[PDB]
């Protein structure tokens, strides 16, 4: 999958202008994702990383942006904060990683 | 309001965040 130019890009767009690119017609190696943890944070809600290999998903969505460390807490179900209230509200039943 | 400096504390360093969304075929597992 064309993930080299997306994850390893030199510059990322702004948070207000986050770039979303549709990914289709390729094979994604999730074994790299769940068998290695170079990524400090890996939070998945509603899905199991084990069943990713044995399941096929359609219309894959990926949002990438840059934020600061202490705001990771606020992006969670059943949580309050300035950002989650006045900037952008996420559903409580959000499913993804 | 964001403070990004080389001499800042390690805490204020920027973080790349990638969120994968699933909404209820072409892409599958790494073959078998």
């Amino acid at each position, epitope marked *: 999958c064309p993930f080299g130019e997306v994850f390893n890009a030199t510059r990322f767009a702004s948070v207000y202008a986050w770039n979303r690119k549709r990914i289709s017609n390729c094979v994604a190696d999730y074994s790299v994702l769940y*068998n*290695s943890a170079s990524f*400090s944070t890996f939070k998945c809600y509603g899905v199991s990383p084990t069943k990713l290999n044995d399941l096929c998903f359609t219309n894959v969505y990926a949002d990438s942006f840059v934020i600061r460390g202490d705001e990771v*807490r606020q992006i969670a179900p059943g949580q309050t904060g300035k950002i989650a209230d006045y900037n952008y509200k996420l559903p409580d039943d959000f499913t993804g990683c | 309001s964001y403070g990004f400096q080389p001499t800042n*504390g*390690v*805490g204020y*360093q920027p973080y790349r965040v990638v969120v994968l969304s699933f909404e209820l075929a072409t892409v599958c597992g790494p073959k078998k």
Partner: antibody
Amino acid sequence: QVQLVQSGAEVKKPGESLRISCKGSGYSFTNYWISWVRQMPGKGLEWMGRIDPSDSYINYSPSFQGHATISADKSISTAYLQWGSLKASDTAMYYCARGRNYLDSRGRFDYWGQGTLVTVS
Amino acid sequence: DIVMTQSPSSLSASVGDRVTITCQASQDISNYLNWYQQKSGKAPKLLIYDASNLETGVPSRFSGSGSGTDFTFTISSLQPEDIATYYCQQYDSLGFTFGPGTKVEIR
């Protein structure tokens, strides 16, 4: 003068529930990850996972079976590990250490405790 | 499905020469590497972790360096009691995987 002391060795009969504790003091307990390390006697270490008291997020080792769950209490700022049904595989000694801060990126477990030995027989 | 090999298994060199062993994983492991010393009648125990944190009382003879796919091992002072089995050790924040290992004996 910060000192961290773990609980002593515990031996319990099969079928009984045992809870071990690791207490941190002199710092924000929920602002630092707590790391747990398991080792079978006569063999090497098996790194199972670490839990943040901020959200109680649980990460499992690839050889996990879901038998044991990790819970933390934010009221007393003390880490706990519980086994609902002790078995032969639970016989080991465990190390609890303060992991990398969630703000830092270079991993480190700063301090070493004396360890807590759990024996099932 | 995963087949990894370590080469060369055996090396012959004169006294004072440098011997370096390399072990590679399926993907890049950055600098996640530790060194274990295994005795005959004793179990291996981790002494230095992350190669940058030193526990009180741990001798300085153990050290680690290198990142990516190339690693180099340097002996500050060779000792007769240094004979052991060195295991390439990769780890992450999710878990840990034991490598096959390579048994090297020095007379």
